DNA sequence: ATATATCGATGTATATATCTGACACGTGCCTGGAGACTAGGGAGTAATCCCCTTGGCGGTTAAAACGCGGGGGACAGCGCGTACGTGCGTTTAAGCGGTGCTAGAGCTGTCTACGACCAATTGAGCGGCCTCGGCACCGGGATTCTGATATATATATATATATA
DNA sequence: TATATATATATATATATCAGAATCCCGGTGCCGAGGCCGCTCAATTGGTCGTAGACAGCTCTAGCACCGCTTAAACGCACGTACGCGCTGTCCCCCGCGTTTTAACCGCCAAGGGGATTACTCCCTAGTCTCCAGGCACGTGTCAGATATATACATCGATATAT
């Protein structure tokens, strides 16, 4: 017979209910560390970082992106949609004031 | 040969926790978060008391400046609960002198 | 000597962050703008923290500089150091 | 002899807060009742936060407060959310919630 | 003869081009003064107000409402509408963070 | 001795403020919510300004108290006093 | 004899800024070069804003700077608008900026 | 029979205006706005310099603290133009001593 | 049958006097800024060390990348009632201008309680080590949903049947 | 031969049922992070001295409140028309769920070495005090850019008569 295959939307609901209740770091540690060092070498060359500095940057970046995705979701639901699109992100960043 | 004498509110937060919950412990990271919270409340109230001292052409921080800073910063029920708590603590100070 | 490491912020990582934010369907052009927005946010915070490290005449960007750089932008971080 | 925290009936330090008010250059002359009032307000705020955190820990069947319990305690309350709106908690989470549009129709 | 009556939308655009060019306080001074005194007498009975305090409150309230209407209009144009709705105001105040 | 003075914030004045905001059409339910939003904003700013007034042993509210209350909330007002 | 604002070539006062740094209880001691550096930065920011405000006043054929000219000068510029983000200019206005969707279809 | 002295930056702003635009005046409300602007810039840079001196366990606001505070608060080209202006003013001071 | 050029009409900005109230400028003075000497303490310079960061190697392994089938959501289009703009007449209420008055704000003199400061001392707080219990991990059972499916169930139809 | 009623049968749809993954929960083991004890050390406490900032009153003066009247501009309500927001439908495409493959992150261990923290010396840089004197601020007066009134050229918006 055909395999037991879920409808599109059930797995997304399960992932929402799973990732909202666990508190790990969703971005991998090493590529974020490489991204931080790549951005930081533009200002001052030959820098050093503590592990707690990269950890603090990762927690701040994840918290900021999760808040931005919450407001982006509310923008998308406001326009009678369930799919977040980029124009929701420019609307959210415009209302928040980060679009200079 | 220790490194340095680091100052923190860990013992006092643990004493407050053992008055509130006699059988609940606390992890190290939760204590560090709560230490940051206590220091942030301290710097907020102290900066507002400094602003109230400068704004009235005064040069001191009495209890009224901190009471007004608590009234400006803390919202709702927390404001008047903390004002009543601080008032009875200042009264218990002065009566025991 | 490096590469383009913004491609290291993978599509499932943005997917998991968006699940934690609570979204159900994600368009295919979300990921490029999320990488750009994250790059802008890090170029703010890292620049302020590097300035804090410049003033102390140090070379290791410690956790305190990151906490102060985040506090200056109105995103206070309880946790590390304080 | 008697410390000022014990005389005032508190547990946050009065002498340390007096030292941090004097040498944190907020004003020229830090008064006498000011560190006691500030320590009492700070002790009340810590007592409220730890009470809600302990309630969230007991509701989750754990006997040790983790940062998720602090996140749940602060954001499940309303006036602490008004106080701590601009702050993020390291190794915390978000509140478990989802909009009713995203839920599947029955 | 039939009178020369403008289409619905032309006079609105003229008023947008006129009030964005003007400077003066749009709300009448005396009802706003009465509103400020009504709100202020809850906190403390028998208060006095300088004139410059009432004009400062009027300027701040007018600028805040104009900024909120800009964000509300951006929300309305986002949802394929030209008419602002109350849900646009709740979305703008929610993304701004003003929802208590 | 007062009346209900929020109806003095008149529907043409919300209309003119929205024309300055750049709005083409107004729904009929904007006005009640705009009155509520303005009432909430004034109940914040006037409360902070009155607290500044009662601190200084004064019974009148100067322009400086309103400037300090607005500066505390993030709406910094150049102009009056400063 | 020679005032320190005239000695450093500036126009903003160095002595008054030194006094306001001294008894403005920012720190215990204040160095000598700090009021001069601060006065130079303040004078540059003022000179930039007066330059753009004079340009905006000459564009509207007025020989006296009103608050609307300052409002236009601040919000037309990029870095000056980014610096004064939450700042409300009293008796100013808004920029003439109408969205393209609201314009009538031709 | 004057009431009190009011210290303000009005004549200094007028000197800067007449060195920038020799034939353009300024209204009184515009002078009050730029007085508020100059005081707000002074308060921002002074507060950040105080915070910078406190975070390094230092007890003197030197010119380096003002330079770092200017590089922190001012964005973009304004930061580098302001630090070039301040550096040449401090250099003129030291040479003219 | 629909796009196009007139043309009546309405609002906008321009020219010019005027008169005016707000801004530029002269004057005293008194207040804070500047010169000089003291004295002291914060901060830079030099050597140490050890602590933590960076770089490298191996290895299993969880997770990202790619591809494919398809289902559901986004987008476009048509229809339409409704809700809002626009205009008109009227009446209310805000703006303005005096006028009293009186309550509250600012200055001033004084003097009193209160906070800074110094030295000694000791009790509280912090670093380091141990030891133990709460949490992490793994395996099995129950549960709790989700998805596909057979069952029966209401509905349209074509022919049998009754009436004229 | 024409007209009207009923009902078995075929068909598109609501619903109980059964199987399949995912997750919670219970228990056993172990493991590592938190609580408790002990030594050191440093900063809070107490007493006495002294400068000074803030409270009390009292005076005065100024500006905020209440009142009245004229004017006239703006709001309010009614009517009408039209453009737009909502809703339904069709479709088409574009994410999603799932499976296989590969690969790069995680963890752990090791070595080098660069820099952060410490301690001491000194030096130069800043607070304090005095004392003189120039700058800035309040006040009064000239004067000139700007608001308002009347008239007018012109941009422009919509209703319409005409051409292909």
Q: Where are the domains of chain E?
A: 10-96
If one counts the domains in chain G, the total is 1
From the list H81, H82, H80, H52, the residue with the least C-alpha distance to H65 is H52
Name the residue facing A95 among E79, E80, E96 (closest C-beta): E96
Helix (H, G, I), strand (E, B) or coil at C7: helix
Tell me the C-alpha distance between G83 and H40, whole Å. 11
Tell me the C-alpha distance between B65 and B51, whole Å. 9
Those residues whose C-beta lies under 8 Å from the C-beta of residue G11, and which sit 6 or more positions away, are G5, G43, H12, H15, H16, H19
Those residues whose C-beta lies under 8 Å from the C-beta of residue B11, and which sit 6 or more positions away, are none
From the list F70, B77, B9, the residue with the least C-alpha distance to D83 is B77
Kindly report the number of other CB atoms within 10 A of residue G59's CB atom.
Answer: 11
What letter would DSSP give residue G104?
P
Residue E70 · residue F24 · CB < 8 Å:
no
What letter would DSSP give residue F9?
S
In this complex, do H19 and G28 lie within 8 Å of one another by their Cβ atoms?
no
Those residues whose C-beta lies under 8 Å from the C-beta of residue F62, and which sit 6 or more positions away, are E50, E52, E53, F53, F81
What letter would DSSP give residue G1?
-
Let me know how long chain A is: 100
From the list H82, F22, C17, the residue with the least C-alpha distance to A73 is C17
Question: Measured between beta carbons, which residues in chain D are less than 8 angstroms from residue H50?
Answer: 25
If one counts the domains in chain F, the total is 1
What letter would DSSP give residue E23?
-
Residue A54 · residue A36 · CB < 8 Å:
yes
Kindly report the number of other CB atoms within 10 A of residue E1's CB atom.
Answer: 3
Residue located via tokens 């914030």: F9
B10-95 CATH choice from 3.40.50.720, 1.10.20.10, 1.10.150.120, 1.20.140.10: 1.10.20.10
Those residues whose C-beta lies under 8 Å from the C-beta of residue B2, and which sit 6 or more positions away, are none
Kindly report the number of other CB atoms within 10 A of residue E52's CB atom.
Answer: 16
Kindly report the number of other CB atoms within 10 A of residue D89's CB atom.
Answer: 26
Tell me the C-alpha distance between H62 and H42, whole Å. 15
- Three-class SS of F36-66: HHHHHHHHHHHHHHHHHHHHCCCCEECHHHH
> What residues 20-79 of chain C have any CB closer than 8 A to a CB of chain B?
76-79
Residue C81 · residue C67 · CB < 8 Å:
yes
Tell me the C-alpha distance between G46 and H40, whole Å. 12
G and E touch with 3+ CB pairs <8 Å, answer yes
Kindly report the number of other CB atoms within 10 A of residue D37's CB atom.
Answer: 32
Residue located via tokens 């510029």: G77
- φ/ψ of E48, rounded to 5, equals -115, 150
Tell me the C-alpha distance between C39 and C31, whole Å. 12
Q: Nearest CA of chain H to the CA of F53: how many Å? A: 21
The CATH number given to whatever domain includes residue C62 is: 1.10.20.10
Domain that includes residue D30, residue range: 4-83
CATH class (in words) of the domain with range A10-96:
mainly alpha
Tell me the C-alpha distance between C44 and C40, whole Å. 6
The CATH number given to whatever domain includes residue D13 is: 1.10.20.10
Q: How far apart are the first and last CA of chain C?
A: 34
What letter would DSSP give residue B57?
T
From the list H16, H64, H67, H22, the residue with the least C-alpha distance to H37 is H16
Q: Nearest CA of chain D to the CA of B2: how many Å? A: 22
Output the CA–CA distances (angstroms, integers) from residue D42 to A48, B89, D10, E17, in the order listed. 37, 12, 10, 53
What letter would DSSP give residue G103?
S
What letter would DSSP give residue D97?
-
Output the CA–CA distances (angstroms, integers) from residue A33 to A54, A62, D6, H61, in the order listed. 6, 13, 48, 35
Q: Give the distance from CA B55 to its chain's centroid.
A: 23
Structure tokens at B86: 């601080």
Residue located via tokens 């803390």: B74
Residue G18 · residue G35 · CB < 8 Å:
yes
Partner D contacted by A26 (CB < 8 A): no
List, comma-separated, the residues after which chain B is broken, a break being a C to N distance over 2.5 A; otherwise answer none. none
D88 assigned to some structural domain: no
Tell me the C-alpha distance between B37 and D10, whole Å. 18
Beta strands C60-61; A83-84: pairing state: unpaired
CATH class (in words) of the domain with range H61-97:
mainly alpha
Question: Measured between beta carbons, which residues in chain E are less than 8 angstroms from residue G56?
Answer: none
In this complex, do F74 and G86 lie within 8 Å of one another by their Cβ atoms?
yes
Helix (H, G, I), strand (E, B) or coil at E7: coil
Helix (H, G, I), strand (E, B) or coil at G12: coil
Beta-bridge partner residues of E49: F61
CA of H60 to C1' of I38 (A): 21
Output the CA–CA distances (angstroms, integers) from residue E43 to B10, E59, F76, H63, in the order listed. 39, 22, 23, 46
Output the CA–CA distances (angstroms, integers) from residue H9 to A93, B57, D1, G39, in the order listed. 37, 19, 54, 12
**Contacting subunits of H (3+ beta carbon pairs below 8 A):** C, D, F, G
- List the determination method: cryo-EM
- φ/ψ of F59, rounded to 5, equals -115, 15
Residue G35 · residue H63 · CB < 8 Å:
no
Q: What Å resolution does this PDB entry report? A: 3.3
Tell me the C-alpha distance between B43 and B65, whole Å. 14
Partner G contacted by A97 (CB < 8 A): yes
Q: Give the distance from CA G69 to its chain's centroid.
A: 12
| F65: exposed, middle or buried (Cβ count in 10 Å: 0-12, 13-18, 19+) | buried
> What residues 20-49 of chain A have any CB closer than 8 A to a CB of chain C?
20, 26-28, 31-32, 34-41, 43-44, 46-49
Which of C78, C79, C80 is best to mutate for the B interface (most B CBs within 10 A)?
Answer: C78
Helix (H, G, I), strand (E, B) or coil at E48: strand
From the list H66, H73, H38, H36, the residue with the least C-alpha distance to H50 is H66
Helix crossing, B77-95 with D33-59: angle to 10°?
130
Tell me the C-alpha distance between D80 and D73, whole Å. 9
Helix crossing, G33-59 with G14-22: angle to 10°?
120
Tell me the C-alpha distance between D27 and D31, whole Å. 10
Handedness of CA C19, C21, C24, C29 (dihedral sign): negative
Tell me the C-alpha distance between A77 and E95, whole Å. 13
Q: Give the distance from CA B9 to its chain's centroid.
A: 11
Tell me the C-alpha distance between C56 and C61, whole Å. 10
Cα angle E42, E44, E45 (rounded to 5 degrees) comes to 90
Chain A residue whose CA is closest to C32: A86
Residue located via tokens 């008697």: D2
H-helix segments, chain E: 10-19, 29-43, 51-78, 86-96
Residue D92 · residue D74 · CB < 8 Å:
no
Nearest nucleotide (C1') to alpha carbon of E23: J147
Nearest nucleotide (C1') to alpha carbon of C62: J116
Q: Which residues of H touch F (CB under 8 A)?
A: 29, 32-37, 39-40
From the list A5, A62, A2, the residue with the least C-alpha distance to A29 is A62
Which strand I nucleotides have any atom less than 7 A from protein CB atoms?
8-13, 22-24, 31-35, 42-44, 52-54, 63-65, 70-75, 83-88, 93-95, 103-107, 114-116, 123-128, 134-136, 146-148
- φ/ψ of C18, rounded to 5, equals -75, -30
């Amino acid at each position: 017979k055909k395999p037991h295959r879920y409808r599109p939307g059930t797995v997304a609901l399960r992932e929402i209910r799973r990732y909202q209740k666990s508190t790990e770091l969703l971005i991998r540690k090493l590529p974020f560390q490489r991204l931080v060092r790549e951005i930081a070498q533009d200002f001052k060359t030959d820098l050093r970082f503590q592990s707690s500095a990269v950890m603090a940057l990762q927690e701040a970046s994840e918290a900021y992106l999760v808040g931005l995705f919450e407001d982006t979701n509310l923008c998308a639901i406001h326009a009678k949609r369930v799919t977040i699109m980029p124009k929701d992100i420019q609307l959210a960043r415009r209302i928040r004031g980060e679009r200079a | 040969k220790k490194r340095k004498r680091k100052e923190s509110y860990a013992i006092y937060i643990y004493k407050v926790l053992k008055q509130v919950h006699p059988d609940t412990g606390i992890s190290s990271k939760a204590m560090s978060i709560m230490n940051s919270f206590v220091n942030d409340i301290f710097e907020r109230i102290a900066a507002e008391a400094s602003r109230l001292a400068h704004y009235n052409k005064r040069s001191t921080i009495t209890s009224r400046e901190i009471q007004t800073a608590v009234r400006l910063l803390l919202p709702g029920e927390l404001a008047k609960h903390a004002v009543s708590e601080g008032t009875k603590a200042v009264t218990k100070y002065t009566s025991s002198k | 000597v490096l590469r383009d490491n913004i491609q290291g912020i993978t599509k499932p990582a943005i997917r998991r962050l968006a699940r934690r934010g609570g979204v159900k369907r994600i368009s295919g052009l979300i990921y490029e703008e999320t990488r750009g927005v994250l790059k802008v946010f890090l170029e703010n915070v890292i620049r302020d923290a590097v300035t804090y490290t410049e003033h102390a005449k140090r070379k290791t960007v410690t956790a305190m500089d990151v906490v102060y750089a985040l506090k200056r932008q109105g995103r206070t971080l309880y946790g590390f150091g304080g | 002899a008697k410390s000022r925290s014990n005389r005032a009936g508190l547990q946050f330090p009065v002498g340390r807060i007096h030292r941090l008010l004097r040498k944190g250059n907020y004003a020229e002359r830090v008064g006498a009742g000011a560190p006691v009032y500030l320590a009492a307000v700070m002790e009340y705020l810590a007592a409220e936060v730890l009470e809600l955190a302990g309630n969230a820990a007991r509701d989750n069947k754990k006997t040790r407060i983790i940062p998720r319990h602090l996140q749940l305690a602060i954001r499940n309350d309303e006036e602490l959310n008004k106080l701590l709106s601009g702050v993020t908690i390291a190794q915390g989470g978000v509140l478990p919630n989802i909009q009713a549009v995203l839920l599947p129709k029955k």
